[PDB]
PDB file of C-alpha atoms in Angstrom:
ATOM      1  CA  UNK A   1       1.094   6.346 -13.601  1.00 31.54           C
ATOM      2  CA  UNK A   2       0.539   4.667 -10.215  1.00 37.07           C
ATOM      3  CA  UNK A   3       2.100   5.182  -6.782  1.00 38.46           C
ATOM      4  CA  UNK A   4       5.664   6.325  -6.880  1.00 38.55           C
ATOM      5  CA  UNK A   5       8.178   4.765  -4.392  1.00 40.35           C
ATOM      6  CA  UNK A   6       8.473   7.548  -1.882  1.00 39.57           C
ATOM      7  CA  UNK A   7       8.416   6.931   1.825  1.00 40.24           C
ATOM      8  CA  UNK A   8       5.531   8.435   3.746  1.00 36.68           C
ATOM      9  CA  UNK A   9       6.643   7.576   7.246  1.00 38.37           C
ATOM     10  CA  UNK A  10       9.285   5.247   8.641  1.00 35.75           C
ATOM     11  CA  UNK A  11       8.684   3.572  11.969  1.00 33.12           C
ATOM     12  CA  UNK A  12      11.374   3.325  14.624  1.00 32.16           C
ATOM     13  CA  UNK A  13      13.490   0.198  14.395  1.00 31.17           C
ATOM     14  CA  UNK A  14      11.864  -1.125  12.286  1.00 28.90           C
ATOM     15  CA  UNK A  15      14.276  -2.557   9.736  1.00 28.58           C
ATOM     16  CA  UNK A  16      13.748   0.468   7.511  1.00 26.29           C
ATOM     17  CA  UNK A  17      14.759   2.731  10.359  1.00 30.46           C
ATOM     18  CA  UNK A  18      17.924   0.798  11.124  1.00 25.92           C
ATOM     19  CA  UNK A  19      18.808   0.890   7.433  1.00 26.23           C
ATOM     20  CA  UNK A  20      18.730   4.675   7.347  1.00 29.81           C
ATOM     21  CA  UNK A  21      15.545   5.232   5.420  1.00 27.74           C
ATOM     22  CA  UNK A  22      13.739   8.514   5.933  1.00 30.14           C
ATOM     23  CA  UNK A  23      10.383   9.910   4.914  1.00 26.68           C
ATOM     24  CA  UNK A  24      10.546  11.492   1.497  1.00 25.37           C
ATOM     25  CA  UNK A  25      13.238   9.103   0.408  1.00 26.27           C
ATOM     26  CA  UNK A  26      12.622   7.841  -3.082  1.00 21.99           C
ATOM     27  CA  UNK A  27      13.616   4.348  -4.151  1.00 21.16           C
ATOM     28  CA  UNK A  28      15.405   4.220  -7.457  1.00 20.40           C
ATOM     29  CA  UNK A  29      16.956   0.781  -7.857  1.00 20.57           C
ATOM     30  CA  UNK A  30      16.688  -2.388  -5.925  1.00 20.81           C
ATOM     31  CA  UNK A  31      19.449  -4.866  -6.636  1.00 19.48           C
ATOM     32  CA  UNK A  32      20.447  -2.742  -9.605  1.00 20.46           C
ATOM     33  CA  UNK A  33      17.024  -2.760 -11.226  1.00 22.88           C
ATOM     34  CA  UNK A  34      15.207   0.498 -11.648  1.00 22.60           C
ATOM     35  CA  UNK A  35      11.640   0.632 -10.395  1.00 24.32           C
ATOM     36  CA  UNK A  36       8.921   3.213 -10.582  1.00 24.25           C
ATOM     37  CA  UNK A  37       6.054   1.968  -8.491  1.00 25.23           C
ATOM     38  CA  UNK A  38       5.718   1.476  -4.769  1.00 24.34           C
ATOM     39  CA  UNK A  39       4.053  -1.887  -5.306  1.00 25.16           C
ATOM     40  CA  UNK A  40       7.086  -3.288  -7.123  1.00 23.81           C
ATOM     41  CA  UNK A  41       9.160  -2.460  -4.079  1.00 22.46           C
ATOM     42  CA  UNK A  42       6.665  -3.884  -1.626  1.00 24.66           C
ATOM     43  CA  UNK A  43       6.639  -7.270  -3.333  1.00 26.20           C
ATOM     44  CA  UNK A  44      10.398  -7.132  -3.247  1.00 25.96           C
ATOM     45  CA  UNK A  45      10.485  -6.655   0.472  1.00 22.55           C
ATOM     46  CA  UNK A  46       7.832  -9.252   1.229  1.00 23.11           C
ATOM     47  CA  UNK A  47       9.734 -11.766  -0.862  1.00 23.18           C
ATOM     48  CA  UNK A  48      13.114 -11.261   0.875  1.00 21.25           C
ATOM     49  CA  UNK A  49      12.737 -11.735   4.617  1.00 17.94           C
ATOM     50  CA  UNK A  50      16.187 -11.573   6.216  1.00 19.59           C
ATOM     51  CA  UNK A  51      17.704 -11.492   2.760  1.00 19.02           C
ATOM     52  CA  UNK A  52      19.624  -8.377   1.852  1.00 16.55           C
ATOM     53  CA  UNK A  53      18.367  -5.879  -0.723  1.00 14.05           C
ATOM     54  CA  UNK A  54      20.580  -3.190  -2.191  1.00 12.99           C
ATOM     55  CA  UNK A  55      18.934   0.163  -2.730  1.00 10.83           C
ATOM     56  CA  UNK A  56      19.941   3.149  -4.659  1.00 12.23           C
ATOM     57  CA  UNK A  57      17.768   6.006  -3.571  1.00 11.30           C
ATOM     58  CA  UNK A  58      17.359   9.704  -4.131  1.00  9.90           C
ATOM     59  CA  UNK A  59      17.167  11.862  -1.054  1.00  8.16           C
ATOM     60  CA  UNK A  60      16.962  15.592  -1.655  1.00  7.98           C
ATOM     61  CA  UNK A  61      17.817  14.921  -5.290  1.00  8.26           C
ATOM     62  CA  UNK A  62      21.207  13.563  -4.238  1.00  6.95           C
ATOM     63  CA  UNK A  63      21.993   9.794  -4.381  1.00  7.61           C
ATOM     64  CA  UNK A  64      22.636   7.239  -1.685  1.00  6.52           C
ATOM     65  CA  UNK A  65      23.164   3.514  -1.435  1.00  9.41           C
ATOM     66  CA  UNK A  66      21.601   1.647   1.451  1.00 14.00           C
ATOM     67  CA  UNK A  67      21.521  -1.981   2.358  1.00 14.41           C
ATOM     68  CA  UNK A  68      18.104  -3.063   3.710  1.00 14.72           C
ATOM     69  CA  UNK A  69      17.240  -6.328   5.403  1.00 13.02           C
ATOM     70  CA  UNK A  70      13.596  -7.291   5.839  1.00 13.21           C
ATOM     71  CA  UNK A  71      12.681  -8.818   9.218  1.00 10.30           C
ATOM     72  CA  UNK A  72      10.914 -12.162   9.169  1.00 10.98           C
ATOM     73  CA  UNK A  73       7.189 -12.194   9.835  1.00 10.87           C
ATOM     74  CA  UNK A  74       5.148 -15.415  10.023  1.00  7.39           C
ATOM     75  CA  UNK A  75       2.676 -14.574   7.247  1.00  8.11           C
ATOM     76  CA  UNK A  76       2.023 -18.332   7.621  1.00  5.80           C
ATOM     77  CA  UNK A  77       1.512 -18.647   3.879  1.00  2.00           C
ATOM     78  CA  UNK A  78       4.446 -18.862   4.360  1.00  2.00           C
ATOM     79  CA  UNK A  79       7.181 -16.427   5.787  1.00  3.07           C
ATOM     80  CA  UNK A  80       7.307 -12.794   4.559  1.00  2.27           C
ATOM     81  CA  UNK A  81       9.481  -9.673   4.606  1.00  5.83           C
ATOM     82  CA  UNK A  82       8.838  -6.675   6.826  1.00  7.52           C
ATOM     83  CA  UNK A  83      10.572  -3.270   7.092  1.00 12.04           C
ATOM     84  CA  UNK A  84       8.060  -1.089   8.949  1.00 13.35           C
ATOM     85  CA  UNK A  85       7.039   1.634   6.551  1.00 14.79           C
ATOM     86  CA  UNK A  86       3.696   3.348   6.716  1.00 16.41           C
ATOM     87  CA  UNK A  87       2.235   3.392   3.193  1.00 19.39           C
ATOM     88  CA  UNK A  88       0.842   6.670   1.851  1.00 17.27           C
ATOM     89  CA  UNK A  89      -2.770   7.030   2.954  1.00 19.62           C
ATOM     90  CA  UNK A  90      -5.256   6.155   0.243  1.00 19.66           C
TER      91      UNK A  90
ATOM     92  CA  UNK B   1       0.428 -15.059  -2.289  1.00 19.58           C
ATOM     93  CA  UNK B   2       0.659 -11.248  -1.887  1.00 19.74           C
ATOM     94  CA  UNK B   3      -1.316  -8.751   0.132  1.00 23.67           C
ATOM     95  CA  UNK B   4      -5.005  -9.294   0.788  1.00 23.45           C
ATOM     96  CA  UNK B   5      -7.828  -6.672   0.588  1.00 25.14           C
ATOM     97  CA  UNK B   6      -8.479  -6.445   4.365  1.00 27.21           C
ATOM     98  CA  UNK B   7      -8.837  -2.951   5.846  1.00 28.98           C
ATOM     99  CA  UNK B   8      -6.358  -1.828   8.522  1.00 26.34           C
ATOM    100  CA  UNK B   9      -7.602   1.552   9.756  1.00 26.10           C
ATOM    101  CA  UNK B  10     -10.429   3.668   8.394  1.00 28.69           C
ATOM    102  CA  UNK B  11     -10.536   7.466   8.719  1.00 27.91           C
ATOM    103  CA  UNK B  12     -12.960  10.384   9.664  1.00 28.34           C
ATOM    104  CA  UNK B  13     -15.053  11.370   6.591  1.00 25.21           C
ATOM    105  CA  UNK B  14     -13.485  10.379   4.235  1.00 24.03           C
ATOM    106  CA  UNK B  15     -15.537   8.697   1.546  1.00 23.95           C
ATOM    107  CA  UNK B  16     -14.670   5.369   3.167  1.00 25.78           C
ATOM    108  CA  UNK B  17     -16.153   6.469   6.483  1.00 27.25           C
ATOM    109  CA  UNK B  18     -19.247   8.014   4.906  1.00 28.39           C
ATOM    110  CA  UNK B  19     -19.608   4.736   2.952  1.00 28.53           C
ATOM    111  CA  UNK B  20     -19.616   2.892   6.287  1.00 32.22           C
ATOM    112  CA  UNK B  21     -16.529   0.674   6.290  1.00 36.07           C
ATOM    113  CA  UNK B  22     -14.538  -0.669   9.184  1.00 33.86           C
ATOM    114  CA  UNK B  23     -11.149  -1.984  10.106  1.00 33.07           C
ATOM    115  CA  UNK B  24     -11.297  -5.732   9.516  1.00 37.13           C
ATOM    116  CA  UNK B  25     -13.541  -5.549   6.470  1.00 34.94           C
ATOM    117  CA  UNK B  26     -12.463  -7.662   3.517  1.00 36.38           C
ATOM    118  CA  UNK B  27     -13.251  -6.681  -0.047  1.00 38.07           C
ATOM    119  CA  UNK B  28     -14.613  -9.523  -2.168  1.00 35.81           C
ATOM    120  CA  UNK B  29     -16.085  -7.938  -5.283  1.00 33.22           C
ATOM    121  CA  UNK B  30     -16.154  -4.531  -6.953  1.00 32.05           C
ATOM    122  CA  UNK B  31     -18.865  -4.236  -9.587  1.00 32.96           C
ATOM    123  CA  UNK B  32     -19.081  -8.014  -9.522  1.00 31.13           C
ATOM    124  CA  UNK B  33     -15.344  -8.055 -10.245  1.00 31.65           C
ATOM    125  CA  UNK B  34     -13.759 -10.301  -7.561  1.00 32.97           C
ATOM    126  CA  UNK B  35     -10.384  -9.236  -6.249  1.00 34.49           C
ATOM    127  CA  UNK B  36      -7.615 -10.868  -4.260  1.00 33.56           C
ATOM    128  CA  UNK B  37      -4.936  -8.218  -3.962  1.00 35.54           C
ATOM    129  CA  UNK B  38      -4.860  -4.957  -2.057  1.00 32.52           C
ATOM    130  CA  UNK B  39      -3.397  -2.940  -4.916  1.00 33.03           C
ATOM    131  CA  UNK B  40      -6.100  -4.192  -7.294  1.00 28.09           C
ATOM    132  CA  UNK B  41      -8.412  -2.309  -4.928  1.00 28.80           C
ATOM    133  CA  UNK B  42      -6.205   0.796  -4.656  1.00 29.84           C
ATOM    134  CA  UNK B  43      -6.044   1.138  -8.424  1.00 27.53           C
ATOM    135  CA  UNK B  44      -9.804   0.847  -8.751  1.00 27.46           C
ATOM    136  CA  UNK B  45     -10.098   3.697  -6.278  1.00 29.64           C
ATOM    137  CA  UNK B  46      -7.633   6.265  -7.515  1.00 28.05           C
ATOM    138  CA  UNK B  47      -8.956   5.728 -11.005  1.00 31.38           C
ATOM    139  CA  UNK B  48     -12.517   6.752 -10.089  1.00 32.23           C
ATOM    140  CA  UNK B  49     -12.893  10.126  -8.373  1.00 33.76           C
ATOM    141  CA  UNK B  50     -16.538  11.150  -8.132  1.00 33.42           C
ATOM    142  CA  UNK B  51     -17.431   7.836  -9.765  1.00 32.23           C
ATOM    143  CA  UNK B  52     -19.212   5.234  -7.623  1.00 34.02           C
ATOM    144  CA  UNK B  53     -18.313   1.667  -6.701  1.00 37.43           C
ATOM    145  CA  UNK B  54     -20.487  -1.402  -6.274  1.00 34.32           C
ATOM    146  CA  UNK B  55     -18.927  -3.202  -3.309  1.00 32.10           C
ATOM    147  CA  UNK B  56     -19.279  -6.587  -1.661  1.00 31.23           C
ATOM    148  CA  UNK B  57     -17.349  -7.258   1.509  1.00 35.78           C
ATOM    149  CA  UNK B  58     -16.917  -9.768   4.330  1.00 36.23           C
ATOM    150  CA  UNK B  59     -17.319  -8.624   7.923  1.00 35.30           C
ATOM    151  CA  UNK B  60     -17.017 -11.442  10.436  1.00 37.74           C
ATOM    152  CA  UNK B  61     -17.796 -13.952   7.693  1.00 36.28           C
ATOM    153  CA  UNK B  62     -21.101 -12.145   7.124  1.00 35.45           C
ATOM    154  CA  UNK B  63     -21.243 -10.825   3.523  1.00 34.66           C
ATOM    155  CA  UNK B  64     -22.471  -7.295   2.885  1.00 36.44           C
ATOM    156  CA  UNK B  65     -23.104  -4.734   0.126  1.00 40.60           C
ATOM    157  CA  UNK B  66     -21.901  -1.129   0.137  1.00 40.77           C
ATOM    158  CA  UNK B  67     -21.298   1.800  -2.168  1.00 39.73           C
ATOM    159  CA  UNK B  68     -18.147   3.895  -2.226  1.00 43.11           C
ATOM    160  CA  UNK B  69     -17.686   7.304  -3.822  1.00 41.39           C
ATOM    161  CA  UNK B  70     -14.032   8.353  -3.695  1.00 41.42           C
ATOM    162  CA  UNK B  71     -13.362  12.021  -2.949  1.00 41.92           C
ATOM    163  CA  UNK B  72     -11.522  13.978  -5.633  1.00 40.52           C
ATOM    164  CA  UNK B  73      -7.873  14.546  -4.723  1.00 41.81           C
ATOM    165  CA  UNK B  74      -5.273  16.473  -6.812  1.00 45.61           C
ATOM    166  CA  UNK B  75      -2.367  14.186  -7.694  1.00 46.13           C
ATOM    167  CA  UNK B  76      -2.405  16.754 -10.492  1.00 51.67           C
ATOM    168  CA  UNK B  77      -1.538  14.033 -12.956  1.00 49.35           C
ATOM    169  CA  UNK B  78      -4.421  14.506 -13.149  1.00 49.81           C
ATOM    170  CA  UNK B  79      -7.179  14.143 -10.480  1.00 51.87           C
ATOM    171  CA  UNK B  80      -7.281  10.941  -8.378  1.00 51.29           C
ATOM    172  CA  UNK B  81      -9.742   8.993  -6.214  1.00 50.75           C
ATOM    173  CA  UNK B  82      -9.529   9.028  -2.442  1.00 49.48           C
ATOM    174  CA  UNK B  83     -11.342   7.359   0.442  1.00 49.99           C
ATOM    175  CA  UNK B  84      -9.357   7.635   3.671  1.00 50.41           C
ATOM    176  CA  UNK B  85      -7.863   4.249   4.342  1.00 50.94           C
ATOM    177  CA  UNK B  86      -4.504   3.560   5.865  1.00 50.71           C
ATOM    178  CA  UNK B  87      -2.804   0.504   4.338  1.00 50.82           C
ATOM    179  CA  UNK B  88      -1.190  -2.253   6.414  1.00 51.26           C
ATOM    180  CA  UNK B  89       2.323  -1.388   7.362  1.00 51.90           C
ATOM    181  CA  UNK B  90       4.843  -2.939   5.080  1.00 52.25           C
TER     182      UNK B  90
END
């Protein structure tokens, strides 16, 4: 296995904040695809600045659907997504 | 592109600290194996607790050679490498 898609910390507004995402939330689908690694999700975000992603998540074992919209960060090579989530500490 | 192997914050001992790494450092090779993505580096780590890593980095353009020995963290599925680095916020 690798790193499961569970939120460590969410910053304050912060796109992830505004969207309702909490620490401990687990991502289950994005745009109706299941995923199982954090990295899969990260690439998804970075690829969709200001585009809307539809998340099904598990929070306390119960389900939730949240719409999340990456902010747009220069990245200069060239324009990336940003939601403001602290990644689990390696 | 993707995410690059540049270190955001380093932590207080901590195999990464003992090993002598700093925020800003960029990983170039691990056991001669060149890398270009952050995750590539994360994998390498978690997969080698107690094992030891031939490192080549770039600090202010100046190349440099270091050795990392990841601590041995649970994960309990089953025993993972750890160094004490916080990843860029995402």
